[PDB]
Amino acid sequence: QFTERALTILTLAQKLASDHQHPQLQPIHILAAFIETPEDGSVPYLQNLIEKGRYDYDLFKKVVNRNLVRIPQQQPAPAEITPSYALGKVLQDAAKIQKQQKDSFIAQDHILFALFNDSSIQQIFKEAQVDIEAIKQQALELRG
Amino acid sequence: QFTERALTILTLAQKLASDHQHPQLQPIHILAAFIETPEDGSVPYLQNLIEKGRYDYDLFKKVVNRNLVRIPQQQPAPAEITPSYALGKVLQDAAKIQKQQKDSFIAQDHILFALFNDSSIQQIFKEAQVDIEAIKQQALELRG
């Protein structure tokens, strides 16, 4: 169903929520997966669909880090309670994307897309459009 | 743009407008383009969505012919003026479908779908090609 890369990004969303002591998984945690590493080679962080597309990766980095700080510290036992409908939908949308893209496996780009398509900055501190075409262009020019 | 399979149908539709010496191309000429000749592989007519959808494609051809004979004029010099705004819409719709499918070219599959969206038989119990949902059920067996 998923590529190893897609599984890595999703898995990181889940484990970052555990490491940050966060309850229900939010779009924020998948965004946390995106900015999980300083490696530029990680498309979700520097050689990004955002950075080479329309917006400063830092804009997004701070959206997420602000949100990760904002979410209160939980008992480790609930730290990653569930993907709920929120991540369920992102993963399902990634599958809808596979169908649209005619892709045999879920790509990390489908997760980037699906998350971005659903997501919006939750606070006034940062703003950015979900520039769907820019993120698709950059995704299409990489790996394949 | 359109590939050769779609272009064949589109070419035939325009030809048919001239075969009937009509000033403009109408949806009926395209439906007539769908049913040109008894060549099985022609998804628009024989190994079609229509039979799979439990409809009689020859009966439908009779419907088409009944509509073709109602074309108001067959005057020579007046013939071949326009593709018509009506089909402008249809071809534009085909382009919309290409976007929906991430397709670099319009296939007969797409041009069929687009007309079907704008097609009709002025009949309650239409003997028309099976409605769009079935069109998708069977059209989606093609390519991918």
Curated annotation (Swiss-Prot), chains A, B:
Q: Reproduce the miscellaneous comment text.
A: Present with 32800 molecules/cell in log phase SD medium.
Species per Swiss-Prot/TrEMBL record: Saccharomyces cerevisiae (strain ATCC 204508 / S288c)
- For the region Repeat 2, give the residue spans: 83-144
Subcellular localization, per the record?
A: Cytoplasm; Nucleus
Q: Which function does this protein serve?
A: Required, in concert with Hsp40 (YDJ1) and Hsp70 (SSA1) and small Hsps (HSP26), for the dissociation, resolubilization and refolding of aggregates of damaged proteins after heat or other environmental stresses. Extracts proteins from aggregates by unfolding and threading them in an ATP-dependent process through the axial channel of the protein hexamer, after which they can be refolded by components of the Hsp70/Hsp40 chaperone system. Substrate binding is ATP-dependent, and release of bound polypeptide is triggered by ATP hydrolysis.
- Identify the stretch(es) annotated as Repeat 1: 2-71
Name the UniProt record assigns to this protein: Heat shock protein 104
The superkingdom of the source organism is Eukaryota
Q: State the oligomer form and interacting partners.
A: Homohexamer, forming a ring with a central pore. The hexamer is stabilized by high protein concentrations and by ADP or ATP. Oligomerization influences ATP hydrolysis activity at NBD2. Interacts with YDJ1. Interacts (via C-terminal DDLD tetrapeptide) with CNS1, CPR7 and STI1 (via TPR repeats); under respiratory growth conditions.
Part of the whole protein covered: 6 to 149 of 908
Induction statement: By heat stress dependent on the heat shock transcription factor HSF1 and the general stress transcription factors MSN2 and MSN4. Expressed at a higher level in respiring cells than in fermenting cells. Expressed in stationary phase cells and spores (at protein level).
Q: Which residues form the Clp R domain?
A: 1-144
Record remark: domains: Has 2 AAA ATPase type nucleotide-binding domains (NBDs) per monomer, a low-affinity, high-turnover site (NBD1) and a high-affinity site (NBD2) with a 300-fold slower rate of hydrolysis. There is allosteric regulation between the 2 sites. ATP binding to NBD1 triggers binding of polypeptides and stimulates ATP hydrolysis at NBD2. Nucleotide binding to NBD2 is crucial for oligomerization. The C-terminal extension is involved in oligomerization.
Provide the taxonomic classification. Eukaryota, Fungi, Dikarya, Ascomycota, Saccharomycotina
Q: Which family does it belong to?
A: Belongs to the ClpA/ClpB family.
